[PDB]
Amino acid sequence: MRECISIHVGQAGVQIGNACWELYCLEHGIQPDGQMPSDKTIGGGDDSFNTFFSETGAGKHVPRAVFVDLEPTVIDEVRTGTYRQLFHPEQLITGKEDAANNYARGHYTIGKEIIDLVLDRIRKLADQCTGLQGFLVFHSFGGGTGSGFTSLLMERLSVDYGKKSKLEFSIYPAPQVSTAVVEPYNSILTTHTTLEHSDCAFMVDNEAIYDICRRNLDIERPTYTNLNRLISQIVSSITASLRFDGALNVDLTEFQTNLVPYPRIHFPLATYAPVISAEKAYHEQLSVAEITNACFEPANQMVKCDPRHGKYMACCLLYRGDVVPKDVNAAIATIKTKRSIQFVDWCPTGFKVGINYQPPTVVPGGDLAKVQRAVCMLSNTTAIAEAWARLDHKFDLMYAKRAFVHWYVGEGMEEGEFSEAREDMAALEKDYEEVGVDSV
Amino acid sequence: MREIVHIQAGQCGNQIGAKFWEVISDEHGIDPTGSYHGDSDLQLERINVYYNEATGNKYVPRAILVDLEPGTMDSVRSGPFGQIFRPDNFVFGQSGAGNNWAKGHYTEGAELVDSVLDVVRKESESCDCLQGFQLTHSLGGGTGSGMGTLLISKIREEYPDRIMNTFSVMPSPKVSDTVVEPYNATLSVHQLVENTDETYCIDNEALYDICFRTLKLTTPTYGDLNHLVSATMSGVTTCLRFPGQLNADLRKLAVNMVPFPRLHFFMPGFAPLLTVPELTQQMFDSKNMMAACDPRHGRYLTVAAIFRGRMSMKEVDEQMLNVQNKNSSYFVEWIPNNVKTAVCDIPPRGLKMSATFIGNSTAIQELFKRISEQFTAMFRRKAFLHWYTGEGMDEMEFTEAESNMNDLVSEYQQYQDATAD
Amino acid sequence: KAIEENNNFIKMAKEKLAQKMESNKENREAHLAAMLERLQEKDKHAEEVRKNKELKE
Ligand SMILES: Nc1nc2c(ncn2[C@@H]2O[C@H](COP(=O)(O)OP(=O)(O)OP(=O)(O)O)[C@@H](O)[C@H]2O)c(=O)[nH]1
Ligand SMILES: Nc1nc2c(ncn2[C@@H]2O[C@H](COP(=O)(O)OP(=O)(O)OP(=O)(O)O)[C@@H](O)[C@H]2O)c(=O)[nH]1
Ligand SMILES: CC(C)(C)c1[nH]cnc1/C=c1\[nH]c(=O)/c(=C/c2ccccc2)[nH]c1=O
Ligand SMILES: [Ca+2]
Ligand SMILES: [Mg+2]
Ligand SMILES: [Mg+2]
Numbered sequence: 001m002r003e004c005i006s007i008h009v010g011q012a013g014v015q016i017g018n019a020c021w022e023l024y025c026l027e028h029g030i031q032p033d034g035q036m037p038s039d040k041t042i043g044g045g046d047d048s049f050n051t052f053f054s055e056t057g058a059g060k061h062v063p064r065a066v067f068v069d070l071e072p073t074v075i076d077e078v079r080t081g082t083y084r085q086l087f088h089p090e091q092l093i094t095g096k097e098d099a100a101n102n103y104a105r106g107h108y109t110i111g112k113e114i115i116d117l118v119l120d121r122i123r124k125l126a127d128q129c130t131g132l133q134g135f136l137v138f139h140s141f142g143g144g145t146g147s148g149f150t151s152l153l154m155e156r157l158s159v160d161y162g163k164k165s166k167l168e169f170s171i172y173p174a175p176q177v178s179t180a181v182v183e184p185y186n187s188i189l190t191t192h193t194t195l196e197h198s199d200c201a202f203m204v205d206n207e208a209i210y211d212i213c214r215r216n217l218d219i220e221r222p223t224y225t226n227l228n229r230l231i232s233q234i235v236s237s238i239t240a241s242l243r244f245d246g247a248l249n250v251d252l253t254e255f256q257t258n259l260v261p262y263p264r265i266h267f268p269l270a271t272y273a274p275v276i277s278a279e280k281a282y283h284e285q286l287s288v289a290e291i292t293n294a295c296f297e298p299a300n301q302m303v304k305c306d307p308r309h310g311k312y313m314a315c316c317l318l319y320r321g322d323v324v325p326k327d328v329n330a331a332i333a334t335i336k337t338k339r340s341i342q343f344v345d346w347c348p349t350g351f352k353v354g355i356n357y358q359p360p361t362v363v364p365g366g367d368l369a370k371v372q373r374a375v376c377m378l379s380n381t382t383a384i385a386e387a388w389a390r391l392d393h394k395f396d397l398m399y400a401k402r403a404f405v406h407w408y409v410g411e412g413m414e415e416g417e418f419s420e421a422r423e424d425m426a427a428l429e430k431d432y433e434e435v436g437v438d439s440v
Numbered sequence: 441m442r443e444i445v446h447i448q449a450g451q452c453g454n455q456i457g458a459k460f461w462e463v464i465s466d467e468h469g470i471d472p473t474g475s476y477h478g479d480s481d482l483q484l485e486r487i488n489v490y491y492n493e494a495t496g497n498k499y500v501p502r503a504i505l506v507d508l509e510p511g512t513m514d515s516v517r518s519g520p521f522g523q524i525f526r527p528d529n530f531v532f533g534q535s536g537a538g539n540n541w542a543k544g545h546y547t548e549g550a551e552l553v554d555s556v557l558d559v560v561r562k563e564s565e566s567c568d569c570l571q572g573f574q575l576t577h578s579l580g581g582g583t584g585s586g587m588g589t590l591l592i593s594k595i596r597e598e599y600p601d602r603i604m605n606t607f608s609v610m611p612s613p614k615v616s617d618t619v620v621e622p623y624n625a626t627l628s629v630h631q632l633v634e635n636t637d638e639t640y641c642i643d644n645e646a647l648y649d650i651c652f653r654t655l656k657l658t659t660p661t662y663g664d665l666n667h668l669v670s671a672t673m674s675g676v677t678t679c680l681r682f683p684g685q686l687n688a689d690l691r692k693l694a695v696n697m698v699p700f701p702r703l704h705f706f707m708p709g710f711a712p713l714l715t716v717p718e719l720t721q722q723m724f725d726s727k728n729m730m731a732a733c734d735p736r737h738g739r740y741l742t743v744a745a746i747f748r749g750r751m752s753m754k755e756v757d758e759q760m761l762n763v764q765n766k767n768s769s770y771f772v773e774w775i776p777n778n779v780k781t782a783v784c785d786i787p788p789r790g791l792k793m794s795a796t797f798i799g800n801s802t803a804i805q806e807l808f809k810r811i812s813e814q815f816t817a818m819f820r821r822k823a824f825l826h827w828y829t830g831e832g833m834d835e836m837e838f839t840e841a842e843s844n845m846n847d848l849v850s851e852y853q854q855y856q857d858a859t860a861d
Numbered sequence: 862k863a864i865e866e867n868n869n870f871i872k873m874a875k876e877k878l879a880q881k882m883e884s885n886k887e888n889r890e891a892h893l894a895a896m897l898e899r900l901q902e903k904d905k906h907a908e909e910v911r912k913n914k915e916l917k918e
Contacts, residue, residue: 011687071441073687096569097441100691108885158874162867175777176757179686181696181742184776197874221753224685397774397860403699403741412889546910597900600893634899832914 001131010146019232034060099144104411106148134165142183147190174207192421237376250354281369310383321359321373385432443567450584453577537582542831544586572603580611580621603690612645675796709797738803749793
């Protein structure tokens with residue numbers, strides 16, 4: 001048991017789901033049709049991969065997942081794509097008319113027509129589970145569905161499943177790849193209304209992933225295909241603890257205990273290594289020390305901020321592949337003396353480690369080099385509030401002139417909801433300030 | 441959201457409509473009968489936006505051809521793609537309007553309006569998911585100016601949650617010397633400010649100046665002006681008519697473009713009338729604007745740029761950053777990241793690389809002030825009111841139309857003067 | 862106390878949500894009710910214009 005149900009909302013959520021599920025399939029030896037030859041127990045099982053995959057009596061290993069979007073064209077490409085046989089038709093749920101980059105339409109107008117259906121389909125997956133652990137919600141901050149429908153869904157999931165855990169993989173917006181001028185509004189609105197209902201949220205800054213694809217992978221103009229493949233590697237590093245069997249493998253919930261010191265302070269900074277091209281990887285084996293050192297280089301972060309000009313409340317290292325504790329400990333001792341890792345006075349400074357022996361996998365015809373070892377650092381640093389600050393500033397510039405506010409008000413929202421959301425973010429920024437202050 | 445319902449009203453509206461349909465039928469690989477003869481699957485992927493699929497794999501426009509004057513029915517039916525239109529969708533009146541707005545809006549066009557609404561409802565009911573409406577018309581005439589704005593207000597009543605878009609042709613003394621055109625435009629603007637989600641100001645003064653100075657033609661016909669409008673209309677509908685990874689419809693794009701409901705009057709532009717830095721400098725230049733206004737006399741609230749052809753996207757990203765850096769004062773600081781760009785693989789017929797420009801600039805007041813000056817020249821001496829007050833109108837309504845357009849200009853100025861701190 | 866507080870959170874989430882979704886449906890309907898009432902006011906004005914043509918002949 002300890003099942004985990006993934007929910008993929010909007011274009012960014014859906015397309016990241018494809019990258020993730022294609023990647024899990026390759027990691028677990030599950031074929032496109034859903035068969036898994038190495039799995040001898042047909043119809044069911046208690047194995048580690050069963051946390052994300054239910055089994056049919058016909059040997060099909062089916063993702064414990066729901067894909068929701070308010071228009072058909074993105075989910076249609078899963079229905080007709082390589083992995084069409086992997087999902088039951090009822091897992092793939094589409095509306096006709098999208099939220100139009102408007103939180104109001106996603107949360108109220110269009111979203112209320114599909115919300116009961118979506119919960120019914122999540123319920124059929126929940127009833128398959130003997131010991132459901134929680135949900136992983138993949139969505140953008142910027143999209144109308146990504147922001148509005150997610151919030152609505154999270155609100156309803158708190159009603160129907162109580163305090164059962166809910167993790168987010170939130171896509172934080174960047175002007176290089178976005179086409180929506182109102183994302184700052186959608187972001188602040190969804191961040192506000194979801195805050196009470198999420199237990200942990202891993203933000204991914206599209207700009208951070210954009211710069212990594214340019215710099216490390218030498219891709220001139222990265223597409224979503226380029227970004228999502230990288231994102232799925234980071235998501236796989238974080239969920240690998242749930243999906244694999246291991247003697248030195250620490251569970252994700254055990255990291256969460258260390259990562260969330262107060263309910264609202266639930267936004268870990270993610271950092272991944274190595275992101276390297278096949279050309280550069282050739283005759284270039286990267287040790288445990290080199291990839292561990294790469295975690296403290298801020299060019300490798302999933303969110304653009306500076307931890308060095310902030311304070312640490314937790315540091316977790318999720319290794320995968322050819323890694324043994326001896327090397328990790330040596331590498332950490334080297335980093336402690338050589339780098340800017342200042343903790344708050346109320347936390348202990350020790351780094352927490354997890355190791356999965358199953359090495360990282362690459363999608364065929366990808367950009368990433370296949371490497372023997374890899375690492376994902378999850379840290380809780382006050383520095384991540386910078387991402388809130390940049391986004392809260394963009395919100396204020398527009399909201400002062402009520403630019404675009406009529407579209408939201410036209411679909412039923414009040415100005416009260418805007419300022420209420422901004423004040424919560426003002427408090428959130430203030431909270432991250434307060435935790436860094438020394439005790440008295 | 442996929443199906444858009446086209447409506448062409450009056451002489452101007454029907455001819456620019458006819459050209460619009462010639463160009464996109466060519467681009468999509470549709471011949472005058474209405475059969476697919478192309479090669480790329482991208483031509484058919486979003487064909488349903490403008491075409492209905494009839495029996496025997498026949499693609500038929502979702503167009504509603506409307507006029508009070510017959511004769512315009514013949515010219516469209518005799519033209520290159522005259523056969524392709526649906527015969528029942530032709531809804532033509534009797535005695536015309538004769539460049540009178542109150543005839544189109546209140547009396548003679550009001551009698552024809554319910555027979556048009558029947559064709560709209562029949563087309564709209566068959567749409568799997570109707571997104572909105574586009575109206576091609578002039579604002580200087582009688583039918584397209586007046587009955588076109590009555591259609592807008594009547595379509596709004598039965599479809600309040602659908603997008604209403606207009607390619608509204610602004611009148612100019614250099615192209616047409618009919619004296620009452622300033623009255624017609626000002627009355628139409630009073631409707632358009634209230635009842636449309638976004639209006640393309642295709643300006644006949646700018647089209648004359650382009651045709652004269654750039655294209656080298658000494659005295660241009662309506663055929664010359666329309667070559668530019670059909671190039672523009674093809675450009676600004678490329679985002680709906682082709683994919684690729686972009687997932688945009690009339691509402692999404694109206695949400696990103698229209699920061700205030702009344703300020704939905706855009707400045708179109710095309711290039712060339714070539715390398716990527718040249719395209720990018722050309723489309724932002726005042727000479728390429730299909731509205732006769734200078735960007736540098738105001739500020740951009742939002743901009744949409746749409747490139748077409750095989751070209752390096754890295755280079756397009758660098759060049760669009762370049763012009764925003766170099767022209768920083770001409771984009772309002774209080775809307776971040778307000779210039780957006782899409783690239784389409786498929787170029788238009790003839791050109792290997794083209795760019796199309798859509799801009800919501802506060803400089804558009806230069807177009808409304810010009811009309812307002814021509815308007816107030818006539819109105820303050822009560823000239824030619826017997827045309828309008830005879831058909832039933834009051835002077836009060838003439839004063840309201842002037843005041844609404846002066847408020848529109850005042851508001852464009854307010855946000856042009858606005859600052860962040 | 863652990864049950865009480867978990868129920869409290871389910872309770873108040875449910876009530877907060879129902880209050881917002883109702884308040885929104887009031888607003889969006891009042892917005893569309895005003896838009897149609899302005900459009901119906903034009904039909905009443907266009908009936909006075911068509912009468913003032915006939916009552917001036
Ligand atoms: N990383 C990543 N970001 C994406 C992807 N697709 C869209 N985005 C980003 O998500 C934001 C836009 O939201 P979408 O998810 O496209 O919109 P949506 O949630 O489908 O909502 P509507 O389309 O408005 O109904 C922008 O910041 C995009 O750049 C993707 O495949 N990967
Ligand atoms: N750009 C362009 N402008 C045109 C064209 N045809 C007419 N116009 C302009 O339209 C204005 C007059 O309006 P029309 O469309 O002819 O009149 P109408 O709306 O059909 O009204 P009636 O003539 O009363 O039926 C003038 O300013 C013309 O210069 C055209 O093909 N292209
Ligand atoms: C990202 C990009 C370039 C697609 C964009 N972002 C905001 N606007 C646009 C473009 C358009 N925006 C529009 O509003 C638009 C209007 C339109 C389209 C078809 C028919 C009538 C109007 N046409 C466009 O090409
Ligand atoms: Ca099994
Ligand atoms: Mg979408
Ligand atoms: Mg005519």
